[PDB]
Amino acid sequence: AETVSFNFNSFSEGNPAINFQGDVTVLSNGNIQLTNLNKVNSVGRVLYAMPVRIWSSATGNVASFLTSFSFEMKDIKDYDPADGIIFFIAPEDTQIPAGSIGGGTLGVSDTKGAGHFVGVEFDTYSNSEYNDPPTDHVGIDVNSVDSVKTVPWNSVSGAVVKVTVIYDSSTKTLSVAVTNDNGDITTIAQVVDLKAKLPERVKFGFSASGSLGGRQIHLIRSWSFTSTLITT
Amino acid sequence: AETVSFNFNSFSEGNPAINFQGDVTVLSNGNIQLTNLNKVNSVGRVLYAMPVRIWSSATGNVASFLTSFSFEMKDIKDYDPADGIIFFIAPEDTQIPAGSIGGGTLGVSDTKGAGHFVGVEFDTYSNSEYNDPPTDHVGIDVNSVDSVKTVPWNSVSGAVVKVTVIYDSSTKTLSVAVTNDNGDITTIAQVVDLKAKLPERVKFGFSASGSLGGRQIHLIRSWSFTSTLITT
Amino acid sequence: AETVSFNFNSFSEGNPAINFQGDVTVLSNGNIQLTNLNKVNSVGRVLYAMPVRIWSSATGNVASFLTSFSFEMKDIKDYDPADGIIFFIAPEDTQIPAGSIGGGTLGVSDTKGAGHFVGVEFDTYSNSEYNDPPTDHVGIDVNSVDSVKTVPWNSVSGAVVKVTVIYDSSTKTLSVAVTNDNGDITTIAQVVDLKAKLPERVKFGFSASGSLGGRQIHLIRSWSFTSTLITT
Amino acid sequence: AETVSFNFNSFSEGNPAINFQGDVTVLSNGNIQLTNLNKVNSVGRVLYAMPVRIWSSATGNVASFLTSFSFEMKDIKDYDPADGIIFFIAPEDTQIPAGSIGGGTLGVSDTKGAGHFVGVEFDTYSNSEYNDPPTDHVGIDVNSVDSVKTVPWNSVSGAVVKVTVIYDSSTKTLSVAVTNDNGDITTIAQVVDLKAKLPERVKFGFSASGSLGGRQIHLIRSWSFTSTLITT
Ligand SMILES: CO[C@@H]1O[C@H](CO)[C@H](O)[C@H](O)[C@H]1O
Numbered sequence: 008a009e010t011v012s013f014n015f016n017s018f019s020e021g022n023p024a025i026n027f028q029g030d031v032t033v034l035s036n037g038n039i040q041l042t043n044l045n046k047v048n049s050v051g052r053v054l055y056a057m058p059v060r061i062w063s064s065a066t067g068n069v070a071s072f073l074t075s076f077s078f079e080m081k082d083i084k085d086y087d088p089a090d091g092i093i094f095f096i097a098p099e100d101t102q103i104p105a106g107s108i109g110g111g112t113l114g115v116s117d118t119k120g121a122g123h124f125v126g127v128e129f130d131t132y133s134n135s136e137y138n139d140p141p142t143d144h145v146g147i148d149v150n151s152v153d154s155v156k157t158v159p160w161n162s163v164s165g166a167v168v169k170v171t172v173i174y175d176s177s178t179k180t181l182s183v184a185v186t187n188d189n190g191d192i193t194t195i196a197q198v199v200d201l202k203a204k205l206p207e208r209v210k211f212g213f214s215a216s217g218s219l220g221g222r223q224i225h226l227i228r229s230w231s232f233t234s235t236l237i238t239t
Numbered sequence: 240a241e242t243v244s245f246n247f248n249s250f251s252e253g254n255p256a257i258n259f260q261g262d263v264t265v266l267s268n269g270n271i272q273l274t275n276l277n278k279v280n281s282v283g284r285v286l287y288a289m290p291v292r293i294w295s296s297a298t299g300n301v302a303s304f305l306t307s308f309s310f311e312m313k314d315i316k317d318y319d320p321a322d323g324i325i326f327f328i329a330p331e332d333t334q335i336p337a338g339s340i341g342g343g344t345l346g347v348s349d350t351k352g353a354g355h356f357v358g359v360e361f362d363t364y365s366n367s368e369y370n371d372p373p374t375d376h377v378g379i380d381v382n383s384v385d386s387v388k389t390v391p392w393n394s395v396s397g398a399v400v401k402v403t404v405i406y407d408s409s410t411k412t413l414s415v416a417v418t419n420d421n422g423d424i425t426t427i428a429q430v431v432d433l434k435a436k437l438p439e440r441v442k443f444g445f446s447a448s449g450s451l452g453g454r455q456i457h458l459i460r461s462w463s464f465t466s467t468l469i470t471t
Numbered sequence: 472a473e474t475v476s477f478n479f480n481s482f483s484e485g486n487p488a489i490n491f492q493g494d495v496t497v498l499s500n501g502n503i504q505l506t507n508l509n510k511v512n513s514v515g516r517v518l519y520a521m522p523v524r525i526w527s528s529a530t531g532n533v534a535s536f537l538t539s540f541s542f543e544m545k546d547i548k549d550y551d552p553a554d555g556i557i558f559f560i561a562p563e564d565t566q567i568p569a570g571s572i573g574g575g576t577l578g579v580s581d582t583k584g585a586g587h588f589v590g591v592e593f594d595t596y597s598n599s600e601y602n603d604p605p606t607d608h609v610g611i612d613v614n615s616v617d618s619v620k621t622v623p624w625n626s627v628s629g630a631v632v633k634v635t636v637i638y639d640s641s642t643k644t645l646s647v648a649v650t651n652d653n654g655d656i657t658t659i660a661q662v663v664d665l666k667a668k669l670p671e672r673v674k675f676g677f678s679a680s681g682s683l684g685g686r687q688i689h690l691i692r693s694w695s696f697t698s699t700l701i702t703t
Numbered sequence: 704a705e706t707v708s709f710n711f712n713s714f715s716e717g718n719p720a721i722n723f724q725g726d727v728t729v730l731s732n733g734n735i736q737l738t739n740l741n742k743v744n745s746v747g748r749v750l751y752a753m754p755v756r757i758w759s760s761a762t763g764n765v766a767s768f769l770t771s772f773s774f775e776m777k778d779i780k781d782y783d784p785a786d787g788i789i790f791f792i793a794p795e796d797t798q799i800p801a802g803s804i805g806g807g808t809l810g811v812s813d814t815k816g817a818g819h820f821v822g823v824e825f826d827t828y829s830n831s832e833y834n835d836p837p838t839d840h841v842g843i844d845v846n847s848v849d850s851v852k853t854v855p856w857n858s859v860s861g862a863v864v865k866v867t868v869i870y871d872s873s874t875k876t877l878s879v880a881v882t883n884d885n886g887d888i889t890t891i892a893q894v895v896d897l898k899a900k901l902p903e904r905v906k907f908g909f910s911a912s913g914s915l916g917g918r919q920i921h922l923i924r925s926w927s928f929t930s931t932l933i934t935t
Pocket residue numbers: 087089090109110111112132134217218219220221
């Protein structure tokens with residue numbers, strides 16, 4: 008079997024295993040701050056440097072994975088807490104969209120909200136142009152920020168949130184479990200054929216964005232991942 | 240929302256939060272040993288004392304849950320390592336089947352392998368009478384030990400295994416991620432409508448069994464659980 | 472360590488984790504109203520269903536706990552605002568006293584004011600037969616409503632009151648911090664050996680009562696609790 | 704009554720309500736980092752600017768207070784995680800000791816471990832010269848880092864810890880409740896006569912320190928406080 012696994016309790020700038028793109032910054036406490044609070048239409052993204060092979064054209068197998076991470080979003084004075092964080096999977100050549108308006112595109116799509124990626128979003132702002140639900144929410148995105156499926160959620164300022172994601176190759180099911188600060192959990196699952204939406208080699212990472220009037224702190228505190236592809 | 244959550248790093252006999260049924264024993268190290276190595280057709284089960292309400296007839300909602308636990312199986316001299324452990328959900332009145340033959344019924348079904356429960360089994364013995372696969376395996380069981388779906392696996396003696404289970408109420412999907420000793424992960428997912436197979440109030444627990452010639456150590460080391468039911 | 476913890480932001484009738492005794496009712500907003508405004512000598516009690524083990528006869532250890540809750544008392548027309556709320560700890564078999572006269576017994580003691588419990592009372596009526604102080608007050612009760620110790624307080628109609636309680640096993644000190652509507656805090660502490668007054672297994676809950684002429688609204692809005700017993 | 708209350712969800716440099724002393728730094732996420740990871744014998748302290756009157760020479764009363772705060776300690780590469788954090792109360796003229804060696808003095812005492820303060824310490828290093836216990840611990844300090852009383856504890860890297868403290872004027876009891884990451888709580892209480900150890904006006908704050916080889920991240924995330932002195 009082909010297995011890739013890593014664990015980050017703290018991040019550091021200069022670690023060859025991580026790729027920073029945009030306004031990403033590494034705080035003294037090891038946390039990653041994705042956006043710059045003083046920039047208009049800010050966008051920051053962090054990726055695992057090494058491309059992971061999620062499927063083989065030789066065998067036809069797709070890999071399974073288990074990943075968990077914790078994040079924190081916090082309100083800043085005078086600005087609307089926006090726009091949110093997104094865990095995504097994209098081709099190995101992925102770069103922040105050219106002329107990115109930040110904001111509701113979460114730093115992964117164009118102005119229409121289209122792009123080439125698959126991901127789970129923790130959206131803290133209702134963008135009517137992308138058909139966002141009227142409340143904070145978690146959603147499964149397949150090549151667009153106009154979510155395929157969403158579920159009501161609640162973002163608490165200064166709260167450490169924990170997430171666990173499981174992808175089962177056989178059923179092609181992607182399920183997420185979000186453990187809120189108060190103990191409550193929120194789940195969402197959707198069938199996504201990674202083999203038909205993405206290429207053999209891909210990169211995993213997080214992205215966040217803001218606008219002119221919408222800004223807040225987007226922190227990534229830890230991240231562990233394991234994937235296994237049956238090579239036979 | 241209605242949330243139930245608990246965390247067990249070590250177990251102790253005398254804790255009103257746990258129900259012991261059968262040959263269950265609590266070791267000095269805080270571990271739970273499910274079966275008795277000196278008994279024929281031994282059976283031991285441990286349940287969370289408080290019944291959890293997984294669905295409401297009033298609203299029609301089903302709860303979502305996230306649970307993780309670690310176990311260990313170890314070979315003993317002269318006996319075949321059998322038969323395995325099973326994480327199950329059953330009605331609040333659940334008791335070890337009358338005249339239980341232990342063995343391949345995992346302590347949850349009658350001789351035909353039928354019963355009233357939903358669970359995930361870590362089977363270390365191929366019982367042809369229940370249509371078991373020819374190797375160790377993980378399987379989803381709905382009211383029977385003749386698994387609805389299974390996936391090849393490998394039980395390593397003396398190895399601590401970790402499991403994470405997510406049930407999404409919306410899709411009614413139950414997904415499991417098993418992290419082996421060597422780092423590799425095994426997953427299996429299946430759609431199970433809990434509202435149609437079980438009653439409003441249920442109990443969660445683990446069960447293990449042996450036979451005359453099949454016996455091994457079955458240990459439960461830790462267990463954390465959280466469920467949330469939307470009451471609206 | 473043996474830890475029991477729960478959190479209630481809202482209560483609902485039908486939740487197996489809660490035991491209702493007496494005139495208790497669950498409002499549409501999730502609050503619990505303890506007494507019935509239309510009944511003479513009304514009494515209502517709510518308990519956490521699962522019995523908690525506060526001490527072990529095996530080791531000799533007593534547990535420590537931290538609990539916080541918020542309540543509201545409101546005046547109704549023509550009736551004297553009485554009699555008050557009481558946070559108590561009693562044996563697992565605890566029931567409203569037979570032939571309870573409600574009133575100044577707070578639904579936990581007999582006519583002489585004796586009973587088997589430990590609790591903190593927020594008394595809004597001076598009952599001279601139980602040697603009550605001449606003003607509203609908070610008191611520590613050990614098997615009697617004739618308080619071991621009391622401190623002047625002031626009950627404000629329609630005001631949300633917050634309370635935090637800490638019990639330190641080592642010193643066997645029980646301290647209470649009451650945060651009034653206007654910001655001021657009131658505290659009271661007393662040494663109470665739980666191991667000598669109560670049995671190994673107990674139940675936690677609140678109780679309220681009224682009389683013929685004394686009636687008012689008694690609301691419980693939220694409640695969180697955590698206890699840890701060192702099992703070694 | 705005389706009441707002083709404040710609440711900090713995030714800290715900012717430039718807020719006249721806070722006094723920074725030493726290597727204190729305010730991160731972009733609003734957290735306060737007490738020590739400098741690149742300095743030998745680093746020391747950082749933060750105090751509430753306004754002096755609080757804990758007792759009156761006119762009446763003879765002592766104030767009661769309820770305070771809660773959350774912190775985080777994190778391991779850095781190559782350095783021993785030391786030395787810890789301390790919540791303290793000292794005279795209004797309090798300054799970092801002259802020629803402070805940092806380390807085991809927690810930035811509040813001289814080399815002998817003597818000083819003029821009262822506080823609760825979260826010690827992550829056993830300094831034999833101050834008679835420290837052999838494990839991590841919480842302790843009550845009265846004018847010395849050679850704790851009057853301590854209790855075993857465990858510091859988990861990257862874990863958000865919550866603490867609640869209550870001081871009852873009548874009994875002169877100070878009790879602390881520490882809620883660990885895994886849910887368990889730790890408590891410690893001690894009788895301390897504030898009126899005989901400190902002057903009428905004092906200042907509240909936190910302090911942290913490191914040495915040459917001992918360094919780690921010390922963060923203060925939030926802090927709320929309320930004190931009430933009966934003026935009559
Ligand atoms: C006016 O633009 C909108 O501003 C919001 C905050 O107010 C969000 O950032 C949206 O993404 C953005 O489109």
